[PDB]
Design a protein around this ligand. Structure first.
Ligand SMILES: *[C@@H]1O[C@H](CO)[C@@H](O)[C@H](O)[C@H]1NC(C)=O
Ligand SMILES: *[C@@H]1O[C@H](CO)[C@@H](O)[C@H](O)[C@H]1NC(C)=O
Ligand SMILES: *[C@@H]1O[C@H](CO)[C@@H](O)[C@H](O)[C@H]1NC(C)=O
Ligand SMILES: *[C@@H]1O[C@H](CO)[C@@H](O)[C@H](O)[C@H]1NC(C)=O
Lengths: 150, 509, 51, 51
């Protein structure tokens, strides 16, 4: 499920490199049954495994194999593969619930906004500073008139 | 496998003749350019002749793109020991009156030393003084001439191969297949000729990637035990004592023996010490595991993970995390080659059988095409969106190729033509979408990563919300109405439940 | 490119060898390789260099 | 372990043969020497020291 596994019967594994369709990996530990993985969900479809390496005492080995990998398996929860994939739907009962929750949130937001739309506002706040500026101009004109009278 | 990135740069550029009687060619010369491809792809080079309907192609296979360096020089550094001998004699004549060398005589060999051998090696004809008297071996109050000769040996015979380099330019492997049928491999460099074979001079180009801590590194390797290590090595013959760069020689056969005529040493590599007619020699040569910054086969200095890739002409590699380099295009030049053309193509017609793959992604979508004809390989598929060329065999067989599509529901009509005959094909199937894979612990990159498609990154309203309701031609409205009614019913139910909960919370406190 | 008329100073072609190969690499750059390489239509500054 | 020294810069191991007397004092170098300190008229062997 995780990846491919290399089995050695002659001797231990010194170093080896595996190849895939569009990916490559290399790992070595020194045991008989070694496991080598590429990524999470990188091999999806029909591909051929081409392993090439050399064992101890200067002995090289080459093998070819084609393994059956699952195609319709996404296994995502909070990534971009959720909002873009709808054909396989590995977890069914989900899109209906998501759309229902979105509709509920939209209706709740609309109901909360209507309470303010129908019923302490800018149209009351602005006349305050407007009349303040008017009173400032009136005081300036009064000072100018006093200066003119002097 | 599949093919892409067609060029067709020098079509109809032949000056041939009747061609041995029925149909032959002479030479084709031009110049083209191949763009960068993902590791594990094929770049076909389809030629076009004015007389022949179709021609063969030239596939380029790339497997790994490792970070190697050039080869500034090559030499072998053998292991040496301390060997020396001396002789105690008396004056007894006028040969040892005052000193051993009168003014400049360095030939301190009176046809008695063992220096005239093939296994002796490098040495320095030096001399010193000894003791005199009845206890030292003489019978006259006069100094005695005592000569000494030292050299180096190699009992074991360990051979080392060092190759200094300070460039570290990107490189890759190319498995080229000629249209005639010959398949060979070679390792091109980033601007260095790759030993042009029958005119083909395909080279690789990089991007001059900087290094973090790669200033003084080499690729010293061992032959017997096949042990590799990363450590700063020396330079050419003009070197300094104190680090790597001890007594070397010219060839590998000159490494087992440390004899002259090929071995080079500057000075001060073996010392001499004596107290009383002893002339003992001590060793100052350091082994390979003695200098600083001596790494091993697994090296993780910086972001690069230097591994040991099994490959000819080089055993040094390394691959960091996904880099997604800018460009890795090639440059192919032709000088002279022959290619046979049939020009006897007959009626051929194929069809599509299967279709599958990813979305517009790395591996693409593979489509199986079946053909049937008498000619060996005369086919050229051309369609919108992507162009793919491949080779077939005689008779009826099955072939699988990959194309690039930009739509989930691939339902179009492409044109297929083999040789001179043409036909029409159709594709119908369902595709999926795969993004860039994520990193997992325990896994390390092997060669490199080319590119990952992450352009759109947005949900498409056409593909999304498709299998939720259904498919038809007038049932979509009914489905939308039913879903809306169910949503309104569930909304009313949830509102009633919330009102009941608030009523229960308010009273009965 | 024969002698008696052709002039070159030094260090215009490199040599590399590993095992009785003596391969040579190219360092000569073409005309479209240096900086500030213009074309037939040139509008550098107020001058419009035509042909 | 290459242990460092505190004040050991110019020291020697001059020893006497007849009386077997030892002393620590800075001595001279090879034949090319300077007059003013130890390093006076020397010779090659021990028998060449009596004369
Ligand atoms: C070893 O590497 C370090 C860091 O790059 C450097 O400072 C040091 O000089 C190196 N040592 C030698 C002997 O080159
Ligand atoms: C086409 O049909 C299925 C579809 O995937 C495939 O498994 C099968 O191998 C193909 N047919 C042949 C003859 O290869
Ligand atoms: C076609 O292929 C067969 C078998 O590979 C070979 O014997 C024959 O010569 C080929 N013909 C041409 C024209 O290439
Ligand atoms: C190109 O022109 C600019 C501005 O005139 C100058 O700074 C630069 O040095 C030039 N480049 C070369 C290679 O001469």
């Amino acid at each position: 499920n995780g990846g491919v596994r290399l089995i050695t019967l002659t001797s231990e594994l010194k170093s080896a490199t595996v190849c895939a369709s569009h990916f490559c990996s290399s790992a070595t530990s020194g045991k008989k049954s070694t496991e080598i993985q590429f990524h999470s969900g990188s091999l999806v479809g029909r591909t051929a495994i081409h392993v090439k390496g050399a064992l101890v005492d200067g002995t090289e080995f080459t093998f070819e194999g084609s393994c059956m990998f699952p195609d319709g398996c996404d296994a995502v929860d909070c990534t971009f593969c959720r909002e873009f994939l709808k054909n396989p739907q590995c977890y069914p009962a989900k899109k209906w619930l998501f759309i229902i929750i979105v509709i509920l949130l939209g209706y709740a937001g609309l109901m909360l906004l209507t309470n303010v739309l129908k019923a302490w506002g800018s149209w009351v706040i602005a006349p305050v500073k407007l009349i303040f500026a008017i009173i400032k101009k009136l005081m300036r004109t009064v000072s100018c008139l006093m200066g003119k009278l002097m | 496998e599949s093919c892409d990135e067609m060029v067709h740069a020098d079509s109809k550029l032949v000056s041939c003749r009747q061609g041995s009687g029925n149909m032959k060619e002479c030479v084709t010369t031009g110049r083209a350019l191949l763009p960068a491809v993902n590791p594990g792809q094929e770049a076909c080079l389809h030629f076009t002749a004015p007389g022949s309907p179709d021609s063969k192609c030239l596939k380029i296979k790339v497997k790994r793109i490792n970070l190697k360096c050039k080869k500034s020089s090559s030499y072998f550094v053998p292991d040496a020991r301390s060997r020396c001998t001396s002789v105690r004699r008396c004056r007894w004549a006028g040969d040892c009156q005052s000193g051993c060398p009168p003014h400049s005589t360095s030939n301190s060999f009176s046809d008695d030393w063992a220096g005239k051998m093939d296994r002796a090696g490098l040495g320095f004809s030096g001399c010193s003084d000894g003791c005199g008297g009845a206890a030292c071996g003489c019978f006259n109050a006069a100094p005695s001439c005592i000569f000494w000769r030292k050299w180096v040996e190699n009992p074991h015979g360990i051979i080392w191969k060092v190759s200094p380099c300070a460039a570290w330019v990107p490189s890759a492997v190319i498995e080229l297949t000629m249209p005639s049928g010959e398949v060979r491999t070679f390792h091109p460099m980033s601007g260095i000729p790759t030993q042009v074979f029958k005119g083909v001079s395909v080279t690789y180009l990089g991007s001059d990637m900087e290094v973090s801590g790669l200033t003084d590194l080499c690729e010293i390797e061992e032959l017997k035990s096949k042990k590799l290590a990363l450590a700063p090595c020396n330079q050419a013959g003009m070197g300094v004592v104190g680090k790597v760069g001890e007594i070397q020689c010219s060839s590998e056969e000159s490494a087992r023996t440390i004899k002259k005529d090929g071995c080079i040493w500057n000075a001060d590599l073996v010392g001499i010490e004596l107290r009383v007619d002893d002339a003992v020699c001590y060793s100052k040569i350091t082994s390979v595991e003695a200098v600083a910054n001596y790494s091993a086969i697994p090296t993780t200095i910086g972001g690069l993970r230097f591994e040991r890739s099994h490959d000819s002409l080089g055993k040094i590699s390394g691959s960091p995390l996904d880099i997604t380099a800018i460009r890795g295009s090639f440059s192919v030049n032709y000088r002279g080659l022959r290619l046979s053309l049939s020009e006897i193509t007959a009626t051929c017609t194929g069809e599509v059988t299967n279709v599958s793959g990813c979305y517009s992604c790395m591996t693409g979508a593979k489509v199986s095409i079946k053909l049937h004809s008498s000619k060996n390989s005369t086919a050229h598929v051309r369609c919108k969106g992507d162009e793919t060329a491949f080779s077939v065999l005689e008779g009826v067989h099955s072939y699988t190729v990959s194309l690039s599509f930009d739509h989930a529901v691939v339902d179009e009509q492409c044109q297929l033509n083999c040789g001179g005959h043409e036909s029409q094909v159709t594709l119908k199937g369902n595709l999926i979408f795969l993004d860039v894979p994520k990193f997992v612990d325990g896994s390390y990159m092997q060669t490199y990563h080319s590119s990952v498609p992450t352009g759109a990154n947005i949900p498409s309203p056409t593909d999304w919300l498709n299998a939720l309701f259904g498919n038809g031609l007038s049932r979509w409205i009914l489905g939308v109405i039913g879903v809306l009614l169910g949503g309104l019913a569930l909304f009313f139910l949830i509102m009633s439940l919330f009102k009941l909960g608030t009523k229960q919370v308010f009273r009965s406190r």
